Amino acid sequence: DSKIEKLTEQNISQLKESAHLRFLDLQSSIDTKKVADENWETCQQETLA
Amino acid sequence: SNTEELIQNSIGFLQKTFKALPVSFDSIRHEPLPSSMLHASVLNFEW
């Protein structure tokens, strides 16, 4: 009746798919940005040398 | 679980399919890959 989601177990699977996707997307997002930090740092050290 | 193994199989299949194509790097830097060079199976998301 309120916006608290639906107990009907037919979209519980839809939640399960979403949980796997959003989580995996966030995991990739941070993995990418830390690689960028490692690279730009290395390039800055190289120019200093 | 189901989705993780699904993704692993899909990424393997994609890696193989894209390793198949002959288009060289410099050829694609300046010219867009035409649609014919891929089978209509890879498109329409039947994998």
Q: Where are the alpha helices (DSSP H) in chain A?
A: 12-48
A6 to chain B, minimum CA–CA distance in Å?
Answer: 23
Breaks (C-N over 2.5 A) in chain A follow: none
* Å between B1 CA and nearest CA of chain A: 9
- Cα–chain-centroid distance for residue A16? 16
Both tokens of residue A20?
């796997």
Q: Does B1 reach chain A within 8 Å, measured CB to CB?
A: yes
In the DSSP assignment, the letter for residue B31 is: S
Torsion B2-B3-B7-B13 (CA) sign: positive
Name the nearest CA neighbour of A25 among B3, B44, B10, B14.
B3
Q: Which one, of A30, A5, A34, lies nearest residue A18 by Cα?
A: A5
The reply to whether A20 touches chain B by the CB within 8 Å rule is yes
Resolution value (Å, 1 decimal): 4.5
Which residues on B lie below 8 Å from A20 (Cβ)?
A: 1, 3-4
Query: What's the token pair of residue A9?
Result: 């177990």
